[PDB]
Design an enzyme around this catalytic site. Structure first.
Site, PDB file in Angstrom:
ATOM      1  N   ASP A  47       9.792  -4.596  16.002  1.00 38.01           N
ATOM      2  CA  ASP A  47      11.000  -3.576  15.364  1.00 38.01           C
ATOM      3  C   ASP A  47      10.230  -2.438  15.181  1.00 38.01           C
ATOM      4  O   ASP A  47       9.739  -2.112  13.801  1.00 38.01           O
ATOM      5  CB  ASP A  47      11.572  -4.014  14.102  1.00 38.01           C
ATOM      6  CG  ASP A  47      12.373  -3.241  13.367  1.00 38.01           C
ATOM      7  OD1 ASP A  47      12.940  -2.152  14.231  1.00 38.01           O
ATOM      8  OD2 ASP A  47      12.814  -3.308  12.272  1.00 38.01           O
TER       9      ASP A  47
ATOM     10  N   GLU B 290       0.781  -1.123  -0.088  1.00 38.99           N
ATOM     11  CA  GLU B 290      -0.018  -0.052  -0.010  1.00 38.99           C
ATOM     12  C   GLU B 290       0.854   1.259   0.177  1.00 38.99           C
ATOM     13  O   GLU B 290       2.062   1.225   0.453  1.00 38.99           O
ATOM     14  CB  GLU B 290      -0.802  -0.117   1.261  1.00 38.99           C
ATOM     15  CG  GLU B 290      -1.840   1.136   1.438  1.00 38.99           C
ATOM     16  CD  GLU B 290      -2.340   1.457   2.396  1.00 38.99           C
ATOM     17  OE1 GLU B 290      -2.531   0.541   3.249  1.00 38.99           O
ATOM     18  OE2 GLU B 290      -2.347   2.682   2.815  1.00 38.99           O
ATOM     19  N   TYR B 291       0.341   2.320  -0.558  1.00 35.40           N
ATOM     20  CA  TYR B 291       1.183   3.436  -0.662  1.00 35.40           C
ATOM     21  C   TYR B 291       0.776   4.666   0.462  1.00 35.40           C
ATOM     22  O   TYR B 291      -0.445   4.752   0.785  1.00 35.40           O
ATOM     23  CB  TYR B 291       1.237   4.104  -1.968  1.00 35.40           C
ATOM     24  CG  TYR B 291       1.897   5.451  -2.254  1.00 35.40           C
ATOM     25  CD1 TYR B 291       3.258   5.531  -1.667  1.00 35.40           C
ATOM     26  CD2 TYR B 291       1.116   6.388  -2.337  1.00 35.40           C
ATOM     27  CE1 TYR B 291       3.554   6.945  -1.718  1.00 35.40           C
ATOM     28  CE2 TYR B 291       1.713   7.793  -2.617  1.00 35.40           C
ATOM     29  CZ  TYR B 291       2.983   8.094  -2.284  1.00 35.40           C
ATOM     30  OH  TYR B 291       3.481   9.252  -2.228  1.00 35.40           O
TER      31      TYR B 291
ATOM     32  N   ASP C 182       6.726  -2.605   7.462  1.00 37.37           N
ATOM     33  CA  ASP C 182       7.878  -3.523   7.569  1.00 37.37           C
ATOM     34  C   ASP C 182       8.060  -4.576   8.824  1.00 37.37           C
ATOM     35  O   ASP C 182       8.375  -4.303   9.755  1.00 37.37           O
ATOM     36  CB  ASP C 182       9.053  -2.451   7.845  1.00 37.37           C
ATOM     37  CG  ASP C 182      10.408  -3.308   7.715  1.00 37.37           C
ATOM     38  OD1 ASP C 182      10.465  -4.427   7.460  1.00 37.37           O
ATOM     39  OD2 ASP C 182      11.278  -2.570   8.226  1.00 37.37           O
TER      40      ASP C 182
HETATM   41  C1  5GX Z   1       9.387   8.509   2.041  1.00 44.57           C
HETATM   42  C2  5GX Z   1       8.041   8.949   1.606  1.00 44.57           C
HETATM   43  N1  5GX Z   1       7.674  10.152   1.393  1.00 44.57           N
HETATM   44  N2  5GX Z   1       6.507  10.636   1.030  1.00 44.57           N
HETATM   45  C3  5GX Z   1       5.759  11.584   0.690  1.00 44.57           C
HETATM   46  C4  5GX Z   1       5.894   9.051   0.968  1.00 44.57           C
HETATM   47  C5  5GX Z   1       6.989   8.382   1.624  1.00 44.57           C
HETATM   48  C6  5GX Z   1       6.555   6.941   1.570  1.00 44.57           C
HETATM   49  N3  5GX Z   1       7.372   5.942   1.888  1.00 44.57           N
HETATM   50  C7  5GX Z   1       6.540   4.635   1.746  1.00 44.57           C
HETATM   51  C8  5GX Z   1       6.918   3.323   1.876  1.00 44.57           C
HETATM   52  C9  5GX Z   1       8.528   2.889   2.412  1.00 44.57           C
HETATM   53  C10 5GX Z   1       9.572   3.966   2.466  1.00 44.57           C
HETATM   54  N4  5GX Z   1      10.842   3.024   3.228  1.00 44.57           N
HETATM   55  N5  5GX Z   1      10.059   2.133   3.725  1.00 44.57           N
HETATM   56  C11 5GX Z   1      10.770   1.035   4.313  1.00 44.57           C
HETATM   57  C12 5GX Z   1      12.011   0.398   3.814  1.00 44.57           C
HETATM   58  C13 5GX Z   1      12.526   0.917   2.651  1.00 44.57           C
HETATM   59  C14 5GX Z   1      13.451   0.436   2.051  1.00 44.57           C
HETATM   60  C15 5GX Z   1      14.090  -1.032   2.306  1.00 44.57           C
HETATM   61  C16 5GX Z   1      13.485  -1.613   3.265  1.00 44.57           C
HETATM   62  C17 5GX Z   1      12.370  -0.796   3.855  1.00 44.57           C
HETATM   63  C18 5GX Z   1       8.850   1.883   3.106  1.00 44.57           C
HETATM   64  C19 5GX Z   1       6.106   2.255   1.841  1.00 44.57           C
HETATM   65 CL1  5GX Z   1       6.358   0.701   2.327  1.00 44.57          CL
HETATM   66  C20 5GX Z   1       4.769   2.782   1.467  1.00 44.57           C
HETATM   67  N6  5GX Z   1       4.483   4.109   1.485  1.00 44.57           N
HETATM   68  C21 5GX Z   1       5.339   4.848   1.590  1.00 44.57           C
HETATM   69  N7  5GX Z   1       5.323   6.342   1.224  1.00 44.57           N
END
Ligand code: 5GX
EC number: 2.7.11.1
Length: 252
Positions: free
Chosen positions: A130, A85-86, A148
């Site tokens: 975590d 999901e975002y 995560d």
């Molecule tokens: C950063 C960021 N800035 N904006 C405006 C939105 C985001 C955003 N990030 C996410 C992310 C997101 C980012 N990092 N991670 C954890 C990770 C990253 C790299 C390797 C292993 C685990 C999750 C997700 Cl899953 C799901 N949705 C996300 N949205």
């Protein structure tokens, strides 16, 4: 049969030890989602295949507004793709360092969100273990969404409880500690046990050594004290937290 070229890859959202995460859109439907890309090599090398199966299998069968949904998975020869999901409004991690620190009202909100999400996980006997600001995401409505599950399972160290770091048996009370540490960091801008050295942090966690800045209410102080106990069972159930006056007063 899902495969990589069903998606268009946007800006890189997060970087990671093993793989990264990009913004992506499925071509057929124009569906925006986050797309975690892990690297078989590095996973095999650090031997975490099991934990990935865990994460996936756990997060896949979870339904809650404060838990980042896991839509599906697939993989190619070299890498493995996690379809997630975002989170539009980003991470709490940046949210904090950006705002320096959070008021009691925002803080207490984010906690009830977590506590809710955690009750749920525990109500399925799942310990996240975590829980840290770079795992907490903000929904479009600004809601907290945990994510995560790379270290999730069933019944840096800043956020780990003593029992964990010492190598002992642990349970749902692990998350309670994290909930504590997290609450402190929101208010103060720094984790209670932060330190320049690893084994220095270890000692401070192990001896439970923290000290509130001037600007934290007896109320906040209270919750945190009750929440950071060396003895797992002294720690409150999540129900207790949820109804902690300071949380009642200020949560929303
Ligand atoms: C950063 C960021 N800035 N904006 C405006 C939105 C985001 C955003 N990030 C996410 C992310 C997101 C980012 N990092 N991670 C954890 C990770 C990253 C790299 C390797 C292993 C685990 C999750 C997700 Cl899953 C799901 N949705 C996300 N949205």
């Amino acid at each position: 049969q899902w495969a990589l070229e069903d998606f268009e890859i946007g800006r890189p959202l997060g970087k990671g030890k093993f793989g990264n995460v990009y913004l992506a859109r499925e071509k057929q439907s124009k569906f925006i989602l986050a797309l975690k890309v892990l690297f078989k090599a590095q996973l095999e090398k650090a031997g975490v295949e099991h934990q990935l199966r865990r994460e996936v299998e756990i997060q896949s069968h979870l339904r809650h507004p404060n838990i980042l949904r896991l839509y599906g998975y697939f993989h190619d020869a070299t890498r493995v793709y996690l379809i997630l999901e975002y989170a539009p409004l980003g991470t709490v991690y940046r949210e904090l360092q950006k705002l320096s620190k959070f008021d009691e009202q925002r803080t207490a909100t984010y906690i009830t969100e977590l506590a809710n999400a955690l009750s749920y996980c525990h109500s399925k006997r799942v310990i996240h273990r975590d829980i840290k600001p770079e795992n907490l995401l903000l929904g479009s409505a600004g809601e907290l969404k945990i994510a995560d599950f790379g270290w999730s399972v069933h019944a840096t160290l800043d956020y780990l409880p003593p029992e964990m770091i010492e190598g002992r048996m642990h349970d749902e009370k692990v998350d309670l500690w994290s909930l504590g540490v997290l609450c402190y960091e929101f208010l103060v801008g720094k984790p209670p046990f932060e330190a320049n050295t690893y084994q220095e942090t270890y000692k401070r966690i192990s001896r439970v050594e923290f000290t509130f800045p001037d600007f934290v209410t007896e109320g906040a102080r209270d919750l945190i004290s009750r929440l950071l106990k060396h003895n797992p069972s002294q720690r409150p159930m999540l129900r207790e937290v949820l109804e902690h006056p300071w949380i009642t007063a200020n949560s929303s």
